[PDB]
Chain length 106, copies 3
Amino acid sequence: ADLEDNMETLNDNLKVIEKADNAAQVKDALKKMRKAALDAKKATPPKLEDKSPASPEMIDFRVGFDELAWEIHDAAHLAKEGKVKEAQAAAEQLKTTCNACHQKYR
Amino acid sequence: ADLEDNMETLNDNLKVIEKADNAAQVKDALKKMRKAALDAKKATPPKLEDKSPASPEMIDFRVGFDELAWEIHDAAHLAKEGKVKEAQAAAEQLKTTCNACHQKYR
Amino acid sequence: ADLEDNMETLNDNLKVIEKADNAAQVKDALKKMRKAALDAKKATPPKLEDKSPASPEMIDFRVGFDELAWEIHDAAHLAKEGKVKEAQAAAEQLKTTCNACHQKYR
Ligand code: HEC
Ligand code: HEC
Ligand code: HEC
Ligand SMILES: [Cl-]
Ligand SMILES: [Cl-]
Ligand SMILES: [Cl-]
Ligand SMILES: [Cl-]
Ligand SMILES: [Cl-]
Ligand SMILES: [Cl-]
Ligand SMILES: [Cl-]
Ligand SMILES: [Cu+2]
């Protein structure tokens, strides 16, 4: 999928997790977010289109999705551990990783 | 290792998982698959040899092994949770990720 | 952070794990190591500064941190499963991955 579609999937599933009742719902949404994060790794964001495809900026962009996927996975572990409120709280904390990349490249 | 050798390790361990008796056999095979997937990330596949090393095609190739590694890890989690036949079925479902990359680059 | 700073974080937390009393101490250190491993993925190491940014050597370098992150995560799983001394021993075994990269690129 294109970058913007993956970002809509990330944003939409944050709100799903926010309103989730149980851990299965949280787990399903985090799974969808992890897939979107890795798929977004394939894209070139408009503000880096003039950069080398392996410039430091593009590497930082791509590695940002590795960091987000690993952080999504930490939240999933908390859900799989039955700790739903903790997984939700962790899913909210993902915004700091969302924001860090946006501040540089959105 | 060679790309071809990593693919043999992926294929061989998919059949090991299919015939496995118990969770330890599944987890050991999935561990070997994850290692092969990440090692295959280092390679340039013959059909992309005339492409730039960070062309969209090479990124898509490399990210495909991130996606496979994460999907392998999901199956390992199910095995770690004792859900053996669920892990085996998940390992069978990896073939859709195997085929998606093959369709494009094999 | 600097590549050098990330390497000191990996080294320091290996000794923290070696002396840890319980699983929360091991988990917290492994989390810091995984973060440093992925951040180190963004760097260009001195020995490869004259290589193209997606040369086979730079890919091998970056994928080495994917492999380390996954091995760190395997050790965390062992901690999260209460197997403290098994996680400590696994953290000690990470040195073979530290050494393999160092031999090529340090
Ligand atoms: C870099 C590593 C990013 C991470 C991590 C996240 N986002 Fe992002 N996002 C990024 C870019 C470069 C862009 C611009 C894309 C474009 O083509 O304009 C975006 C955009 C969004 C959007 C708006 C999409 C649009 O219509 O243009 C949203 C709603 C969004 N991002 C949400 C989002 C969330 C919730 C994230 C973490 C959970 C997140 N993004 C991570 C780069 C990166
Ligand atoms: C891209 C991201 C791939 C993924 C994911 C998987 N495979 Fe693959 N495979 C890929 C290529 C480009 C090639 C051709 C390599 C060559 O040098 O010809 C292959 C090849 C195979 C083979 C045959 C190996 C050979 O002797 O040439 C097998 C048996 C194979 N692949 C199996 C396999 C399985 C089971 C996968 C999922 C678990 C899988 N591959 C993923 C690229 C990619
Ligand atoms: C490549 C994939 C590496 C892996 C995996 C690890 N290290 Fe590393 N390290 C690497 C390079 C190219 C360098 C030299 C660059 C530099 O930072 O100087 C290093 C360096 C170190 C150092 C010295 C830091 C300094 O002040 O120069 C230490 C103490 C170190 N590395 C530790 C370390 C540990 C414990 C690792 C595994 C857990 C590890 N490194 C992995 C490249 C790579
Ligand atoms: Cl996950
Ligand atoms: Cl936007
Ligand atoms: Cl790259
Ligand atoms: Cl990568
Ligand atoms: Cl795994
Ligand atoms: Cl083939
Ligand atoms: Cl971890
Ligand atoms: Cu895990």
